[PDB]
Design a protein around this ligand. Structure first.
Ligand code: GTP
Ligand code: QW9
Ligand code: GDP
Ligand code: CA
Ligand code: MG
Ligand code: MG
Lengths: 427, 437, 332, 54
């Protein structure tokens, strides 16, 4: 059951590259795509993310997309750039200028068919394609605008497959440009209709985790991406390794998503770790459980205590007593029953994987469909209207052919999304 | 002799079929290559074990069984496992992508595409049957295939085999081993559609099998392999009369005659004892009165409920091992005085008993210990309706918010089929209510 | 921390227990329909016993015994005694009783015997001396009532010729230990007793509210045990224990050990305790009779503090430990 | 009490002890529900591919 991975834009390719670094290392694949590992459990489900090339080399089933060649040239020169298929690099030249309209309507349109051709070439060789995962950001132009254009076009050509995104939400604490609320609000409107599962990775939360918990005084995008590549390895554990649940992208959406629009999950990771610095005192399972439900480990700046969990999926990596895991997971549900909806029974799921991530003896990844995620969309909706009611910076978009209406519409659909999350918060 | 065809649907059905057929082979002295030395009639026979195994001129004994999953992962293990040579591949049927925990996907979308293939492969087994009595269907309530495709298959067998009996071994869903949050939906949807097409259904609540494995086998975290090897002993107890010489429950129609006086109320409660650990070698062998007494402790039931607060409509005792009728009647008299065994006014307060002297067999290196005598009680008691209420409540909690209903409508189902199924279940609880008070 | 839910808000008793439970810092109250509870103070109509004991990692306890209605429903109480060879033939402590269905033979079969023996032929549902005045009266109701002998020779406190009944509170825990509360109550009629023409409504049928006088001799018509023992001591040269309590403890033990194999939760997937309330009557021969069993009882305002605590000590915290006695264990 | 109908075999025996006496759809109609849901499948998908056309 193969997955086709797509990374678009600066942020898309950087967290995209690190992801392939992390999971290649976990599966024992080298920058040359040759398997030098010590366990056949590394290979059992390697076809999900890797194609088997000639000479038994492994090539990521990955498509790299950008409207300028800068970031993708850096990936190719990066640590693992040689593992990627060179035909799967698809770049433009003029760039999208942190402009949703350029990625979605004008500059992206020239390039979008060249990408879909590479997508088709990868899907055709799949035994049984289950779906796609897109890494991108919502604040820029290429990943924000062209990414949501590919999603709409992939839905056209593969309407019965799963669309998965790791979408990086913008924050003034980590801000490239004042138009980021415009780009995100236009992308969220697309994600609501054309994705099945979206991991809301808020740069606001990644900064606070780097600054406050990790005591990094001035963190880089590489420090934030370290947190992202660890989360992405977590949420993909049951895909990449064998388990009891017979895990696929569709079953995840069936069980996580009670209503089709409310498919925006808060990721979480434990323990939280900085780069290079190693932790030697391993954790107790009570510590893993307690941290992964703690707001300080949430990758979206929302307080889950300000909402209620519709569904939760926890995945533990490492050698540990699964009876203790069950006891501890049952403990937090029973101690905090008010923060779980009572009309969805048995709405917490726990899987375990024996293989730990490089660095830690045991980890825990958290995925949550909380109604507190509205706090994130409220943030974007406020930052949006602060500019929009003066029509500020709108010339950047109308010059590319867009109308004021399309902004007003996107504003309303997101505000609707907020009120729906509030609908089920007060049940 | 009259043949019975076993059909295993979905992961739970397939894996339990493995558990049962491995045990069936050990009981009948059949080897993983199909050879049965003790069988002198080579290439044929109307013996009782031929009710479940047909024969080839080469001396192989082949299960009258078909395995169907909408995904190859579980059945491919059968194709490569210890008993790979037992089945011919036309009996192992796989799709490419499962029903994703969705009844509507298993019944309509993927089921419609493969139902005719399965029925054709089933017809190949029926055309080796001089007199077919019916089918034994193994499935789960919770999976999309186990729930969706089974109700489709069961509707069709009523058409193609109208007069043949159909029995169910159904796995009732339990959070301790739950694969999906929508399993109450799948359970109610499948039971409603299948009810008219099933003659007798033995529900096995995974919660019961879990706790039994934990208490009596001292397994802190039981596996599917742990659960299924226990279940196969209960299934073996129920089918033994069809595979061995005996007077009780010889045809499939006797199960409904002895256990089902009312058509809708066809869910007997199975109770099995003794379950003793293989690691505990220091043991104390339980008498007839001790194991019969355990049949009325709810901890040994395949569904947790309180028979004392319900009425019985029929009660069978299936003993295996060193048992004589005198000790049985003595045990019954002792128990009758000390336990709340109320029968309905329209049925006799009797017990139908059968005894097989071959003691229960155990898988070598299993978790179950070899015992001198075992019993399986089959009681049709209204107290089992507790399981329906539990299931229907969880259904009512989610459906009030129409949670997850869109995944089902997105496959062609209508919201009204949910309400049809829940009303049927609501009637089923009332039917159990009238009989029990 | 332990968790509990409250599904009977009119419970005079368990209102206090949830108050005491919260006031420990080790118990949190959830919403009524939250399934992840350690303890349930369930309702009185259709308590969902079938849904209890199925939460993983949760020891569930409930304050009601499934099947105790047959002891607390008069029509079934009567049926329980006539049939059970644990109480048959004629347990010398239960009034000769009969159940009557409104639109039967045995009620008349012995009614003649007590006018043709010229015996005490008074009965009770409300009261009357003639059969037709109740059989036709029950037919007026539609609800099935029971009919039984009316004890015409009551013991009477002095001064005042006061008729009373005795209510002892009993607590059975998950181990089926029978705990009799050391403090009982006498609900004395505050008005003297009529003995011949009983058409007078509340002149003799003692109910705590039917007397609505009510609160004259001692507050609330409630004489506690320390006084009733002293009256017997001074007025009859005996004690409450010998004259009355040995029989009360016998009947409680007898009634509760009868239905024990039917309601016990010894090996169930959920545990159960229940507070019962027995109602007794004493005649002039110092002979204790069983009026009714009340499975949803209420205490007296002087004793709530002490009783509603002993429930927590021996019936709740014995299953959910934290970090002299007021009961009398009736051994069996 | 009363043991009745005892049949003895070499593998075992059977009997019945009493303690007290007492006191389908058509293949046609299947497709008219099966196929009627493949159509709702396609009506919903058409409205999607139409919405993507706009
Ligand atoms: N006792 C037992 N229960 C099982 C087994 N496998 C799955 N289950 C239970 O079955 C339910 C799900 O049914 P599955 O058989 O896994 O579903 P399926 O038939 O494969 O349907 P799909 O969703 O298409 O995969 C869960 O509640 C499990 O607890 C098994 O091998 N033994
Ligand atoms: C445990 O996490 C996951 C689970 C699945 C998965 O296939 C799955 C199948 N069935 C369930 C659930 C069953 N009951 C639930 C209650 C709440 C939440 C969930 C997910 C469930 N999950 C897939 C995942 O990656 C694709 C995944 O991430 C690592
Ligand atoms: N976490 C993280 N965020 C990034 C990274 N690069 C850019 N961003 C965020 O993404 C937004 C800029 O979008 P960008 O990807 O550079 O524009 P694009 O090339 O048109 O897709 C800003 O809000 C940045 O904070 C990165 O490497 N890591
Ligand atoms: Ca033969
Ligand atoms: Mg940038
Ligand atoms: Mg399956």
């Amino acid at each position: 059951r193969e997955i086709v991975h797509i990374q678009a834009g600066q942020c898309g390719n950087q967290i995209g590259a690190k992801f392939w670094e992390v999971i290649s290392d976990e599966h024992g694949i080298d920058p040359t795509g040759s398997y030098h590992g010590d366990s056949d459990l590394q290979l059992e489900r390697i076809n999900v993310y890797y194609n088997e090339a000639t000479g038994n080399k492994y090539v990521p089933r990955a498509i790299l997309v950008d409207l300028e060649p800068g970031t993708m040239d850096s990936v190719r020169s990066g640590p693992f750039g040689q593992i990627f298929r060179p035909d799967n690099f698809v770049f433009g030249q003029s760039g999208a200028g942190n402009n949703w309209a350029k990625g979605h309507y004008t500059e992206g349109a020239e390039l979008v068919d060249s990408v879909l051709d590479v997508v088709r070439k990868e899907s055709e060789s799949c035994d049984c394609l289950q779906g796609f995962q897109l890494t991108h950001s919502l604040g820029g132009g290429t990943g924000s605008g062209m990414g949501t254009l590919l999603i709409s076009k992939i839905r056209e050509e593969y309407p019965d497959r799963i669309m998965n995104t790791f979408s990086v939400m913008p924050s003034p604490k980590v801000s490239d440009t004042v138009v980021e609320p415009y780009n995100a609000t236009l992308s969220v409107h697309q994600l609501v209709e054309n994705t099945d599962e979206t991991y809301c990775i808020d740069n606001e939360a990644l900064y606070d985790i780097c600054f406050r918990t990790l005591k990094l005084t001035t963190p880089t995008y590489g420090d934030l991406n370290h947190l992202v590549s660890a989360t992405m390895s977590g949420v993909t554990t049951c895909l990449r390794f064998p388990g009891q649940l017979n895990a696929d992208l569709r079953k995840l959406a069936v069980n996580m998503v009670p209503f089709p629009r409310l498919h925006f999950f808060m990721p979480g990771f434990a323990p939280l770790t900085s780069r290079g610095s190693q932790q030697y005192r391993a954790l107790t399972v009570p510590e893993l459980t307690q941290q992964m439900f703690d707001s300080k480990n949430m990758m979206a700046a929302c307080d889950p205590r300000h909402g209620r969990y519709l569904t939760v999926a926890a995945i533990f990596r490492g050698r540990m007593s699964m009876k203790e895991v069950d006891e501890q997971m049952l403990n937090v549900q029973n101690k905090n029953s008010s923060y779980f909806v009572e009309w969805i029974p048995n709405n917490v799921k726990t899987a375990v994987c024996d293989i730990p991530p490089r660095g830690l003896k045991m980890s825990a990844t958290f995925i949550g469909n909380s109604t507190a995620i509205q706090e994130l969309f409220k943030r974007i909706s406020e930052q949006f209207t602060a500019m929009f009611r003066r029509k500020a910076f709108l010339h950047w978009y109308t010059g590319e052919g867009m109308d004021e209406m399309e902004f007003t519409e996107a504003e309303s659909n997101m505000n609707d999304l907020v009120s729906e999350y509030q609908q089920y918060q007060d049940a | 002799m009259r043949e019975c065809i076993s059909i295993h649907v979905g992961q739970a059905g397939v894996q339990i079929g493995n558990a049962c057929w491995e045990l069936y082979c050990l009981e009948h002295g059949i080897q993983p290559d199909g050879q049965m030395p003790s069988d002198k009639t080579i290439g044929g026979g109307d013996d009782s074990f031929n009710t479940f195994f047909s024969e080839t001129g080469a001396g192989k004994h082949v299960p009258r069984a078909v395995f169907v999953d909408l995904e190859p992962t579980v059945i491919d293990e059968v194709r490569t496992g210890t008993y790979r040579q037992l089945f011919h591949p036309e009996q192992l049927i796989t799709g490419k992508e499962d029903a994703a925990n969705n009844y509507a996907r298993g019944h309509y979308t993927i089921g419609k595409e493969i139902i005719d293939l399965v029925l054709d492969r089933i017809r190949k087994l029926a055309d080796q049957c001089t007199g077919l009595q019916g089918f034994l269907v193994f499935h789960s309530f919770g999976g999309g295939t186990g729930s969706g495709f089974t109700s489709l298959l069961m509707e069709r067998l009523s058409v193609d085999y109208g007069k043949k009996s159909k029995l169910e071994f159904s796995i009732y869903p339990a959070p301790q081993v739950s694969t999906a949050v929508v399993e109450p939906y799948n359970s109610i949807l499948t039971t409603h559609t299948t009810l008219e097409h099933s003659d007798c259904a033995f529900m096995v609540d995974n919660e019961a099998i879990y706790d039994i494995c934990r208490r009596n086998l001292d397994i802190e975290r039981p596996t599917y392999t742990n659960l299924n090897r226990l279940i196969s002993q209960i299934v073996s107890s129920i089918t033994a009369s069809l595979r061995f010489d005996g007077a009780l429950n010889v045809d499939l129609t006797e199960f409904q005659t002895n256990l089902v006086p009312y058509p809708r109320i066809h869910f007997p409660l199975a109770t099995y004892a003794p379950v003793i650990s293989a690691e505990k070698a220091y043991h104390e062998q339980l008498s007839v009165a001790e194991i019969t007494n355990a049949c009325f402790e709810p901890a040994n039931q395949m569904v947790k409920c309180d028979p004392r607060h319900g009425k019985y409509m029929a009660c069978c005792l299936l003993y295996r091992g060193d048992v004589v009728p005198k000790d049985v009647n003595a045990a019954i008299a002792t128990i009758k005085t000390k336990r709340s065994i109320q029968f309905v006014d329209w049925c006799p307060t009797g017990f139908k008993v059968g005894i097989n002297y071959q003691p229960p067999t155990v898988v070598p290196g299993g978790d179950l210990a070899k015992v001198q005598r075992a019993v399986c009680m089959l009681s049709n008691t209204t107290a089992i309706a507790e399981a329906w209420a539990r299931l229907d409540h969880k259904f009512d909690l989610m459906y009030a918010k129409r949670a997850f209903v869109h995944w089902y409508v997105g496959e062609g189902m209508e919201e009204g089929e949910f309400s049809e199924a829940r009303e049927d279940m609501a009637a089923l609880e009332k039917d159990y209510e009238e009989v029990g008070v | 921390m332990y968790t509990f839910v409250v599904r009977d808000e009119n419970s005079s008793v368990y209102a206090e227990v949830s108050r005491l439970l919260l006031a420990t810092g080790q118990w949190k109250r959830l919403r009524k329909d939250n399934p992840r509870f350690n303890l349930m103070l369930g309702e009185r109509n259709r308590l969902p016993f079938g849904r209890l004991g199925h939460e993983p990692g949760l020891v569930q306890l409930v304050n009601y015994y499934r099947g105790a209605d047959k002891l607390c429903r008069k029509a079934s109480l009567v049926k329980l005694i006539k049939t059970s060879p644990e109480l048959s033939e004629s347990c010398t402590w239960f009034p000769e009783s009969y159940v009557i269905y409104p639109t039967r033979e045995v009620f008349l079969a012995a009614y003649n015997r007590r006018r043709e023996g010229r015996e005490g032929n008074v009965w009770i549902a409300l009261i009357s001396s003639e059969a037709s005045e109740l059989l036709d009266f029950i037919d007026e109701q539609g609800q099935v009532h029971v009919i039984q002998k009316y004890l015409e020779k009551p013991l009477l406190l002095e001064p005042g010729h006061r008729k009373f009944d005795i209510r002892s509170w009993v607590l059975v825990d998950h181990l089926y230990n029978i705990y009799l509360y050391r403090e009982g109550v006498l609900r004395t009629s505050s008005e003297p007793y009529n003995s011949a023409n009983f058409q007078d409504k509340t002149c003799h049928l003692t109910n705590h509210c039917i007397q609505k006088n009510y609160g004259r001799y001692e507050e609330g018509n409630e004489m506690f045990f320390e006084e009733f023992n002293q009256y017997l001591m001074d007025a009859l040269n005996t004690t409450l224990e010998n004259s009355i309590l040995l029989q009360i403890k016998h009947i409680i033990r007898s009634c509760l050990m009868c239905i024990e194999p039917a309601i016990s939760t010894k090996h169930l997937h959920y545990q159960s305790f229940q507070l019962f309330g027995f109602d007794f009557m004493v005649d002039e021969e110092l002979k204790v009779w069983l009026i009714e069993v009340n499975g949803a009882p209420a205490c007296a305002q002087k004793l709530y503090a002490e009783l509603c605590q002993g429930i927590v000590d021996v019936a709740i915290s014995s299953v959910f430990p934290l970090a002299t006695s007021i009961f009398i264990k009736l051994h069996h | 009490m009363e043991v009745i109908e005892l049949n003895k075999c070499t593998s075992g025996q059977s009997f019945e002890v009493i303690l007290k006496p007492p006191s389908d759809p058509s293949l046609e109609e299947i497709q008219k529900k099966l196929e009627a849901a493949e159509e709702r499948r396609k009506y919903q998908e058409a409205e999607l591919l139409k919405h993507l056309a706009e």
